[PDB]
Amino acid sequence: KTHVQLSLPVLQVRDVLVRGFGDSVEEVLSEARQHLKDGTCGLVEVEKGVLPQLEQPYVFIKRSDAAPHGHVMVELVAELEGIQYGRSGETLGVLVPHVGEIPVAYRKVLLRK
């Protein structure tokens, strides 16, 4: 399938134990995709002061369309020193590994895979 229905645990930035996916744009996008497939991916909602508490490169989910079965269609865009790899819509949040942190909510997305 080109798209997969996922429910992403929304984590508080201060709870997050593993604050990024790796050390290159290509690695973080790779690792994000693997974690999304394995159900081991969390989402941090971006507000003032969130991103400086996480590790670059960042992986964002961005709205790719204007929402089947409640699931917002999203795609991945990486960022490193203010340059983004990808072009998409509004940020739903920044992806991080999930290693058992308690979420505050779930975000239903349809991921272009």
Residue 15 sits in a domain whose CATH number is 2.30.30
Write the CB contacts of 13 (distance below 8 Å, at least 6 apart in sequence). Answer: 44, 50, 53, 54
Domain range for 101: 3-112
- Report how far residue 79's alpha carbon sits from residue 54's, in angstroms, rounded to the nearest whole number: 12
- Report how far residue 40's alpha carbon sits from residue 51's, in angstroms, rounded to the nearest whole number: 20
- Report how far residue 86's alpha carbon sits from residue 77's, in angstroms, rounded to the nearest whole number: 5
Which amino acid type is present at position 3?
H
The count of structural domains within the chain is 1
